[PDB]
Amino acid sequence: PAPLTLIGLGPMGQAMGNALLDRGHGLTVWNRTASRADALVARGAVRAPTVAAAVAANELVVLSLTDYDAMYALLGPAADALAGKVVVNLSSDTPEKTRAGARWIAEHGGTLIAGGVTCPPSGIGSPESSAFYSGPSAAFERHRETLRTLTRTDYRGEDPGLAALWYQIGMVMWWNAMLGYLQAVALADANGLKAADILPHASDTVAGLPFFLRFYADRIDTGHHGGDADRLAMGTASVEHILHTMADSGVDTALPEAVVALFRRGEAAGYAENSFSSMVELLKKPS
Amino acid sequence: PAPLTLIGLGPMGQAMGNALLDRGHGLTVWNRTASRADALVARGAVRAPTVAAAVAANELVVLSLTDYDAMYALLGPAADALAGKVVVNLSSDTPEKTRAGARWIAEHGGTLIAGGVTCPPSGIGSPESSAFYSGPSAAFERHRETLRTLTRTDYRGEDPGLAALWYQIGMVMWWNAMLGYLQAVALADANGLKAADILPHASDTVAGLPFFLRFYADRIDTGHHGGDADRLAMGTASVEHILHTMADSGVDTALPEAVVALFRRGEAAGYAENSFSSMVELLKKP
Ligand SMILES: NC(=O)c1ccc[n+]([C@@H]2O[C@H](COP(=O)([O-])OP(=O)(O)OC[C@H]3O[C@@H](n4cnc5c(N)ncnc54)[C@H](OP(=O)(O)O)[C@@H]3O)[C@@H](O)[C@H]2O)c1
Numbered sequence: 001p002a003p004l005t006l007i008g009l010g011p012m013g014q015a016m017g018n019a020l021l022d023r024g025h026g027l028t029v030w031n032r033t034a035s036r037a038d039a040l041v042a043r044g045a046v047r048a049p050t051v052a053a054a055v056a057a058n059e060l061v062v063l064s065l066t067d068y069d070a071m072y073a074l075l076g077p078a079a080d081a082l083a084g085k086v087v088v089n090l091s092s093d094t095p096e097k098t099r100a101g102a103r104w105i106a107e108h109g110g111t112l113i114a115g116g117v118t119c120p121p122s123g124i125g126s127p128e129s130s131a132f133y134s135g136p137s138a139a140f141e142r143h144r145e146t147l148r149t150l151t152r153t154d155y156r157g158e159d160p161g162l163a164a165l166w167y168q169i170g171m172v173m174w175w176n177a178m179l180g181y182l183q184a185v186a187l188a189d190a191n192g193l194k195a196a197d198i199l200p201h202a203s204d205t206v207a208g209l210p211f212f213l214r215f216y217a218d219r220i221d222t223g224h225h226g227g228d229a230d231r232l233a234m235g236t237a238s239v240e241h242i243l244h245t246m247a248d249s250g251v252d253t254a255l256p257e258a259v260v261a262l263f264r265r266g267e268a269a270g271y272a273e274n275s276f277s278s279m280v281e282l283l284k285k286p287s
Numbered sequence: 288p289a290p291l292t293l294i295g296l297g298p299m300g301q302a303m304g305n306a307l308l309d310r311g312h313g314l315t316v317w318n319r320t321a322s323r324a325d326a327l328v329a330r331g332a333v334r335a336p337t338v339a340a341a342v343a344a345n346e347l348v349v350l351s352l353t354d355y356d357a358m359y360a361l362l363g364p365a366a367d368a369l370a371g372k373v374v375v376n377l378s379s380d381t382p383e384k385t386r387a388g389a390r391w392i393a394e395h396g397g398t399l400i401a402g403g404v405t406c407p408p409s410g411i412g413s414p415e416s417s418a419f420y421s422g423p424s425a426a427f428e429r430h431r432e433t434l435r436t437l438t439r440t441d442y443r444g445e446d447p448g449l450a451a452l453w454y455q456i457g458m459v460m461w462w463n464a465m466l467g468y469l470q471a472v473a474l475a476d477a478n479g480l481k482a483a484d485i486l487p488h489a490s491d492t493v494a495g496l497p498f499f500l501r502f503y504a505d506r507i508d509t510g511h512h513g514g515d516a517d518r519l520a521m522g523t524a525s526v527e528h529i530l531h532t533m534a535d536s537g538v539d540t541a542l543p544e545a546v547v548a549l550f551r552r553g554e555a556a557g558y559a560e561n562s563f564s565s566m567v568e569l570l571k572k573p
Pocket residue numbers: 008009010011012013031032033036064065066067069070073074090091092093117118119120121516517518521525
C-alpha cells in the first residue's frame with residue numbers, strides 16, 4: 001500500500017484514516033483541531049506538525065473538508081509548495097467551484113482530482129460503497145489503488161465538474177427524502193408515535209421507489225408525459241392531503257407548502273391531465 | 288363469502304370488485320358513471336339502479352371515491368338509508384376529514400371504518416398487498432374476513448383517523464423523493480445526461496435510505512442529536528451546493544431554496560453543531 005497525506009478529520013476523514021491504516025498505508029494526517037487526530041496517531045498515523053509539512057510528506061494529498069473554500073483557507077499559505085502534488089479533494093461543492101479549485105491547483109503546479117463519496121463514514125472501507133471521480137486520467141489511474149481502499153472508484157472523465165455534478169444529482173434526492181423522514185417523524189410525534197414505530201412502513205415505502213424510478217425514467221426520456229399512468233391533478237390532491245394533515249397536527253408545513261406550490265405550478269402550466277413527470281419541464285426553466 | 292356493496296368504480300374500485308367476484312362474494316355495484324360497472328356486471332355483479340338501492344342492498348358498503356367530500360355528495364341524498372350500515376371508506380384524506388366523516392356516518396345511524404390502501408390497483412387481491420384500518424373494532428372485526436379479500440388488514444386503533452394518518456406518514460417521503468428525482472433529471476438534462484443515465488445512481492440512493500432511517504431512528508427518539516456522523520452546518524453547505532448547482536445550470540431552484548431555508552432555520556435556532564436530524568425539533572408540534 002502506498003503512503004499518503006490526509007487533511008480534514010471530520011466524520012468522513014476519521015473513517016478514511018482508520019480504513020487506510022487498516023490497509024497498512026503509511027498515513028500522515030493533519031487537522032485544524034489537532035485533538036481529532038489523537039486516535040489515528042495512536043493507531044500508527046504520523047501527525048504532521050503543520051499543514052505545509054503534511055503536504056510535503058507525500059505526493060498524494062487527500063482532503064475531506066466542508067467545501068472548496070476550506071481548501072484555499074488550508075492550502076493557501078504554503079501554496080507555493082504544491083508543485084508536483086496530487087490533491088484528491090473529496091469535499092462537496094458545485095461543478096463551477098470544483099473547476100475553480102482545479103484551476104487554482106494547476107496554477108500552483110499541482111493537479112486536482114475531484115471526488116464525491118456517496119457513503120456515510122461507517123461505509124468507508126467497505127466494497128459496497130462508491131465514490132465519483134473526475135479529473136486528470138493519468139494521475140487518477142496512478143493513485144486508483146490507494147483510493148480503492150476507501151471506496152469503489154467510478155471515474156467519470158477529465159472535467160473535475162463531473163464528480164461534483166454526479167454527487168449533487170444523487171444528493172438532491174437524498175436530502176429531499178431524509179427531510180421528508182424528519183417531516184414524517186414530526187407528524188408521528190404529534191400523534192404519540194415514535195420514529196421506531198413508523199420505521200418499518202417508512203422503509204417499505206422508500207424501498208419500493210426504484211420500481212417507480214425505472215417506470216418513469218423511460219417515459220421522461222421519450223419527452224412525452226401522458227396522463228395514462230397518473231394524473232398530476234390527483235398528485236396535487238395527494239400532496240394537499242399531506243400538507244393539511246401536517247397543519248392539523250400543529251407540525252411545521254414549510255416543506256409541504258413548497259411541494260404543493262410546485263404542483264400548483266404544474267396545473268398553472270396546463271398539466272393537470274398529464275403525468276406529474278410533466279413538471280420536469282417546469283423544473284428545466286431557469287429561476 | 289359474505290355479500291357486500293361497492294360504490295366508486297375507478298381503477299381502484301374496479302380491482303376490488305374483481306377481487307371480490309374472484310373470491311365468490313355476492314357483489315352489488317353502483318357508480319356515478321354507470322358504464323364503469325359494465326365489465327363487473329357482465330361478470331355477475333348486481334347493478335344497483337340508484338345509490339339509494341345500492342346502500343339498502345347490503346350491510347357492508349365499501350367506498351372507493353376521491354375524497355370524503357365525494358362521500359357527502361354521493362351519500363347525502365341517501366343519508367336516511369345509512370342506519371345500521373357499516374361504511375368502509377377506502378378513500379384517502381386527512382385524519383380530521385376522516386374523523387368528521389365518521390361523525391357524519393354516526394349521526395345518520397351508521398358506523399364508519401376507514402382504510403388506507405398502500406398498493407396500486409394491480410395490488411388488490413395480491414397476497415403481499417396491505418391496507419391500514421381504523422375505526423370501531425367490533426364493526427371492523429365483523430367484516431375483517433371480507434376486507435382481507437382485498438389486502439392484508441392492518442388494524443391500527445379505534446380512532447377513525449389513524450388509517451389516514453399512517454397513509455400520510457409514508458407519502459411524505461414518497462413524494463419528496465419522487466419530486467427530487469424530477470429535480471435530478473432536470474439537472475442531468477441541463478448537463479447532457481438523460482434519466483436513463485442517472486437511473487442507476489438514483490436507484491442506489493433510494494435503496495440505501497433504510498440504513499439511514501434506522502440509523503437516525505433511535506437517535507431522534509432519545510433526543511440524541513450529536514454530530515458524530517454529520518454536522519448540520521456541513522449539511523447547510525451541502526444543500527447550498529445543490530441550490531447553486533441548480534442555479535449555475537439554469538434550472539429551477541424553488542424546492543432547493545425551500546431545503547436551504549429549513550437548514551438555515553436549524554442554524555438560526557442554535558443547532559449548527561448538532562446532527563441534521565435535530566431539525567425535527569423545529570418541525571415538531573409545541
Ligand atoms: N458526513 C458525511 O456523512 C458525508 C459523506 C459524504 C460526503 N460528505 C462530504 O464530505 C465532506 C466532509 O464532511 P464531514 O461530515 O466529514 O465533516 P465536516 O463537518 O464538513 O468537517 C470536515 C473537516 O473540515 C474542516 N474544516 C471546515 N472548514 C474549515 C476551515 N475553514 N478551515 C480549516 N478546516 C476546516 C474541519 O476541521 P475541524 O476538525 O478543525 O473542525 C473538519 O476536519 C463534506 O464536504 C461533506 O459534504 C459528507
